[PDB]
């Protein structure tokens, strides 16, 4: 089984004090921390074999290219894609989803067509569709949520129609912790003639992804949430869809022939990788994948289920605290204290060393659905512990006591 | 003055052998190497204060945000922009130019309008314009080149007309080493009612940039060519132009309000930074700027002019070698050996430890203008030396002798 002391020992940033207290980092849904294996991968790249890729074929250039494409194959295996042609390196989840909205949705929507999303989506999985339907005259529709913040398949079936061309939905909600029924929703989308776009930013770090079992048409993820470098992500798309989509960006490395007025594109995946690519970051993301696979995603999921179940229980021990979302969940808890604004909660918690996020978490329509303007969110990863949750609930208790006194 | 031994001591990657020979890295136009000051900046970020920015305002989140925006101010000062609102962090030069083609050109071109570029442009400054004119029904035009590969202002004046809306041009050619007369071309563009887009990927690393003196409307650059991390670049644009352009990507952090169907955008620069940004890479690019400014861009330019003048002289000592471009130039030499294909030249040179690039250098129309299919290119930076140029010319001599014997 996974030893949380031995795992934490690999993350230098955890071992420091904030405002005189041991750091308690509970904001991994915003971004995760890195183990030495990843940081030292970046170091070794810049110390030893940095060079541009797919260009000069001298010795360092070959090493960098092999490292970059080797990381692409690591990603392919990690999400169980059929082919490296289906694995596109991007700047992050947000850019991946925007590439689908630009190159697939804007080429495949007509008036009368529908894009169907849900009220729990992150802005990254809302605004690109708002913009694509405006540009095409198509219609945007929202699957309603059950009272506990889950999605019923009956509601999916009612909302998706024979006019739906795209269903876009999160694998895991960054606010509710809901794990959505992506595989069953893919069947519903296909049955109606639609493709499904899966926002996997919060699922990929925490649980095994098998795109062949999910049968998603597109799947987007971010390195910085899964122990990898900032600035890099992946767009997966079924090869037959990517073959028919035009590039979202144009430039070097993604062309075959350039004339004065017309150009032709490389084969996949490079068709979608204009310019010098995110070489070091992609290689470090491959290192993050090796790190997570050595621990075991199923072990990481089990650890997070234990932390989530413990946190929910201990939150129920606090009077005057509201928790949003379902009992079965990913590793995060979004909440409010009665009569204390979440920004103030976050301030007091940081004074105790505890990092959480307050605000709308880039999900304003969901806050409106919840009938709140803001919330506070503690989120967990493989380096967090029950003792840290104890510190969180103790600090919420003392926050309530403090704000009741004055 | 700058001490090249002390500068090289800071670049760990230079100190190694390739195929039994000291490495001679002459491919900095493809990508530059990094000093410890930059690599250690990334280390310190991941070891000590990684957190997402402009989101959770806990202690590490504040440190990361301050580091990210502090790097933006470093860039602003470095290119002498008036305002941080004008400094957009992107994935690289290619993405920056594509954002201009998407958000400015496609919104501002009608049939009859012209985009004017030159035959020496890199593909990154060709294809986005090809695509924008096709999408708008506008016309793409090319300023011709003089016999030495420079641009005469008379030709600029003849090509730009009152129908030109955009002139796009490189500051420095990655093939010819030409430094183009950007400031005078900006006056010509403005006189005709056009904006000028400057591709500064090869100028920014090597010479001071002052966008107020150049009066360029847009200016694009890449971190990885100027001792900075991969995966990051800058788009500069005059504030009044950026204010009127729509975002190229949509998502978190670049919104003010998100409704079900409509959203409003943040102020500049964040309007153009969708999603979690390239936090570590931007901070490391700020470190690269501090490093270069401490050495002095004018010292770096002088050093490169000495290396270029020495290389041109020594190339003229070789029989049967053709060099392309003008005598006054940036720090690079593109050439061919009579009767030896440039790919074979590059192979033999790598066997001697020497890294150069062979091919079309992402400038196919320029190769056609030069009446060649490919070339070889040695390119210099602040860690290179005359002794390395000696090794290059000696190895070209022995390449000629070898291929004449068989
Ligand atoms: C479900 C979901 N979908 C898309 C994204 C955007 O991922 P990027 O790597 O920013 O591009 C995120 C990232 N949500 C972060 C940062 S806003 C959080 O604090 O909740 C997400 O949670
Ligand atoms: C004049 C010019 N303009 C745009 C670019 C593209 O920069 P990126 O950082 O790849 O996006 C480059 C990069 N030319 C490299 C790599 S193809 C070379 O080996 O010559 C350039 O030289």
Could you characterize the architecture of this molecule?
- Chains A, B: It catalyses: (sulfur carrier)-H + L-cysteine = (sulfur carrier)-SH + L-alanine.
- Chains A, B: This is Cysteine desulfurase SufS.
- Chains A, B: Keywords: Pyridoxal phosphate, Transferase.
- Chains A, B: It holds the Pfam family Aminotran_5.
- Chains A, B: Belongs to the class-V pyridoxal-phosphate-dependent aminotransferase family. Csd subfamily.
- The structure is a homodimer of 406-residue chains.
- Chain A is α/β, with parallel strands linked by helices and 406 residues long.
- Chain A folds into two domains: 139 residues, no CATH class; 261 residues, Type I PLP-dependent aspartate aminotransferase-like (Major domain) (Aspartate Aminotransferase, domain 2, 3-Layer(aba) Sandwich).
- Helices cover 41% and strands 17% of the residues of chain A.
- The first copy, chain A, contains 14 helices and 17 strands.
- Chain A has a seven-stranded mixed sheet with strand order 4-10-9-8-7-5-6, sandwiched between helices. A four-stranded antiparallel sheet of chain A has the order 13-14-17-16, covered by helices on one side.
- In chain A, helix 2 runs antiparallel to helix 10 and helix 3 crosses helix 10.
- The longest helix of chain A is centred in the N-terminal third of the chain and has 21 residues.
- The radius of gyration of chain A is 22 Å and the shape is globular.
- Chain A starts with a helix and ends with a helix.
- Chains A and B meet through helix 2, helix 3, helix 4, helix 5 and strand 11 of A and helix 2, helix 3, helix 4, helix 5 and strand 11 of B.
- Bound molecules: the ligand Cc1ncc(COP(=O)(O)O)c(CN[C@@H](CS)C(=O)O)c1O (2 copies).
């Amino acid at each position: 089984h996974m030893n949380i002391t031995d795992i934490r020992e690999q993350f230098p940033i955890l071992h420091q004090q904030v405002n005189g207290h041991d750091l308690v980092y509970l904001d991994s849904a915003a971004t995760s921390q890195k183990p030495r294996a990843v940081i030292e991968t970046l170091d070794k790249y810049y110390n030893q074999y940095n060079s541009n890729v797919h260009r000069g074929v001298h010795t360092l250039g070959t090493r960098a290219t092999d490292g970059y494409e080797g990381a692409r194959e690591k990603v392919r295996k990690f999400i169980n894609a059929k082919s490296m042609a289906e694995i596109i390196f991007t700047k992050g989840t947000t850019t991946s989803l925007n590439m689908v909205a630009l190159s697939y949705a804007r080429a495949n929507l007509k008036p009368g067509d529908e894009v169907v999303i849900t009220y729990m989506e992150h802005h990254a999985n809302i605004i690109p569709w708002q913009q694509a339907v405006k540009a095409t005259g198509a219609t945007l529709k929202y699957i309603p949520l059950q009272e506990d913040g889950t999605i019923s398949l009956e509601d999916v079936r009612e909302t998706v129609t024979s006019n739906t061309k795209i269903v876009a939905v999160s694998h895991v909600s960054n606010v509710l912790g809901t794990v959505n029924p992506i595989k069953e929703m893919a069947k519903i989308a296909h049955d109606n003639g639609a493709v499904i776009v899966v926002d996997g930013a919060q699922s990929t770090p925490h649980m095994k992804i098998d795109v062949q079992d999910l049968d998603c048409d597109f799947f987007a993820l971010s390195s910085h949430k899964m122990c990898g470098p900032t600035g890099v992500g992946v767009l997966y798309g079924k090869k037959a869809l990517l073959e028919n989509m035009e590039p979202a960006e144009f430039g070097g490395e993604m062309i075959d022939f350039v004339g004065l007025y017309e150009s032709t594109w490389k084969e996949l995946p490079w068709k979608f990788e204009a310019g010098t690519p995110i070489i070091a970051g992609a290689i470090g993301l491959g290192a993050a994948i090796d790190f997570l696979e050595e621990i075991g995603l199923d072990e990481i999921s089990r650890h997070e289920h234990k932390l989530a179940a413990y946190a929910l229980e201990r939150f129920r021990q606090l009077d005057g605290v509201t928790v949003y979302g379902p009992e079965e969940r990913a590793g995060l808890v979004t909440f409010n204290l009665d009569d204390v604004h979440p920004h103030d909660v976050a301030t007091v918690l940081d004074a105790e060393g505890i990092a959480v996020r307050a605000g709308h978490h880039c999900a304003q329509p969901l806050m409106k659905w919840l009938d709140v303007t803001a919330t506070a969110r503690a989120s967990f990863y493989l380096y967090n512990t029950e003792e840290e949750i104890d510190k969180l609930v103790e600090a919420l208790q003392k926050t309530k006591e403090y704000f009741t006194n004055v």
